Symmetry: none
DNA sequence: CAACTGACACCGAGAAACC
DNA sequence: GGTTTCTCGGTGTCAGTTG
């Protein structure tokens, strides 16, 4: 249980996702949030985390199921919203720039 | 344990629509399972769920607030974890107008 | 028309509570 | 011990909104 917390911390610390820490206390971080309708949407890099969380919890299986980034994007938002681990800073969410992003926070 | 004899009396009563058998030995029966959408009504669709709460004194009429979600959750959690009831997932028609589930009463 | 969202319902699997 | 319920961290559904 509670695999979402440690998984996301490991994803941010990995740096493999070009989602970064916004402070050095490792308590507030960035996260990309590009809309899948924009002409700047690469289905691979933009939906990389959303696919990974579906691959992690055994929801999407390669070469077996039809890909669907919308469902992958919806599952991660509901997980972050429902989990008592991450509180989103909606007033700091800069969701209207060249590369939109949200801001979250982790508590004890 | 009161779940076995109680449910057998509910199906045999025929008071709830959809709660019927599938053989003459009364060992395989359909249970009406809808999603709370469509023509869902708290009366006819969620009647058996209220009976279990009243039977086990979990809901007093006019005192506790009606909560059909947890009423169906209690009956589900007890029905699934019961060893007197086998869920036949292969005949479980979940993709129809009035979806039902097939349960078998194991003898003992 | 696809994509997105919040509000609400749903779920299984250990962990309790309760015979 | 054996049975019913409670917890919890996810997930699904819908109706309206949005790019």
């Amino acid at each position: 249980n509670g695999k979402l917390r440690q998984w996301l911390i490991d994803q941010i610390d990995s740096g493999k996702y070009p989602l970064v820490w916004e402070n050095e206390e490792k308590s507030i971080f960035r996260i990309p949030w590009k809309h899948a309708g924009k002409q700047d949407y690469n289905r691979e890099e933009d939906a990389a985390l959303f696919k990974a969380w579906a691959l992690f919890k055994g929801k999407f299986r390669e070469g077996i199921d039809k890909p669907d980034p919308p469902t992958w994007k919806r599952r991660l938002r509901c997980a972050l919203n429902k989990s008592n681990d991450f509180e989103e800073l909606v007033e700091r969410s800069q969701l209207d720039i060249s590369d939109p992003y949200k801001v979250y926070r982790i508590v004890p």
